[PDB]
């Protein structure tokens with residue numbers, strides 16, 4: 001049964017046309033309205049030349065428009081490329097050129113974020129009368145499952161990011177497994193938290209819309225105060241939270257310090273993205289108990305959002321008193337999460353090795369990085385029609401079947417919840433004329449450098465320099481000269 005992600009959505013619209021699909025603090029859309037609007041934009045896009053394998057930039061803010069935008073790109077047959085408005089011009093323009101994007105879905109407020117852009121631009125906030133003249137009907141046969149759905153950039157240790165190419169087929173697999181794992185229903189109300197720069201936004205968006213649940217888009221202001229984040233979730237009657245682990249750690253700390261009650265509607269908290277602190281897990285069970293359910297999800301971007309999860313609420317007392325909390329078991333039978341030795345053989349239970357992913361979860365590869373692709377996406381010697389992705393994560397399967405994350409073999413870290421290659425920051429710092437050698441380490445970020453010429457305002461100079469090349473979370477808050 002060949003299916004694209006938008007087809008899955010379109011099936012749901014047919015079942016529940018009048019259900020509310022998306023709610024923001026400023027307005028809402030029914031499944032019908034969302035679908036009709038995404039179709040009008042997709043038709044327009046098709047006339048701009050968007051077709052299977054066409055990459056389309058999306059530089060939008062979190063809004064009803066953003067959701068129409070994504071789905072319209074998908075419906076037209078194109079793959080979107082998130083272009084985070086908070087990133088600096090130079091980074092965004094590099095992405096646009098690397099991806100060869102000639103169609104950009106954006107808004108007027110993001111004018112002039114790309115340098116020297118000669119492609120087609122659509123501004124969803126000011127061109128809606130035009131888009132409304134296009135057909136409201138579903139498009140047919142614009143893609144096959146092996147065509148791209150999105151290309152999402154991640155940090156690159158050689159000094160520029162690179163695009164992880166995701167096909168409809170793996171995203172559709174993921175989405176259908178996750179709906180069944182989380183038990184999402186038409187009664188759920190799921191908070192959309194993370195930027196579309198993070199593949200987890202796809203979990204939040206497509207899990208919700210392809211099951212008939214309501215997607216509630218957050219604001220910037222609601223996250224900066226945990227009290228506010230909780231109260232707004234109560235007011236909205238949110239049933240499902242999807243939180244970056246570093247955020248949930250903050251939330252656990254404040255829940256207990258301030259004895260805040262959780263929203264009465266909340267049934268499920270999904271965390272992931274970095275190593276969960278066992279001490280805060282213990283504190284959650286002590287103060288909150290087994291409801292809402294708490295799930296730890298693991299996966300790299302290259303494995304399409306998540307490959308394994310662990311229901312923490314279902315662990316025993318002693319499974320939770322280890323020094324590591326598990327990342328659990330595969331999301332489904334067509335996804336393999338192996339712990340392999342240095343020759344790609346499985347190992348006895350409780351033996352540590354490197355995590356390799358196989359099966360349906362795999363990305364196609366990295367966009368325009370054939371060396372890097374060959375190095376990470378490897379033909380399986382024991383199964384030559386298939387590939388494995390080399391995660392760079394160490395782990396071991398415990399005797400109970402649960403996987404444990406045991407850290408990294410390399411210099412990728414998570415800072416403030418974001419995937420960062422230290423090498424990327426090193427490489428860029430080395431470009432600066434006053435830097436001769438440089439090493440950056442965690443932990444937060446600390447840059448160590450041998451100057452050509454020292455200067456007492458070098459810290460502020462180097463942060464200025466980085467600010468116009470890297471996202472803010474890659475900017476070290478401290479420098480050391482040797």
Ligand SMILES: [N][C]([C][C][C][N]C([N])=[N+])C(=O)O=P([O])([O])O[C][C]1O[C](N2[C]=NC3=C2N=[C]N=C3[N])[C]([O])[C]1[O]
Nearest residue numbers: 270271272273274275297298299300301305306405419
């Ligand atoms: N994809 C994502 C994840 C997801 C989860 N959550 C949900 N699903 N809800 C991510 O994160 O991706 P990236 O950015 O690529 O990165 C990856 C990395 O990180 C880490 N992790 C994840 N998750 C986790 C971790 N650790 C620990 N624990 C957990 N849970 C690793 O390193 C990977 O590779």
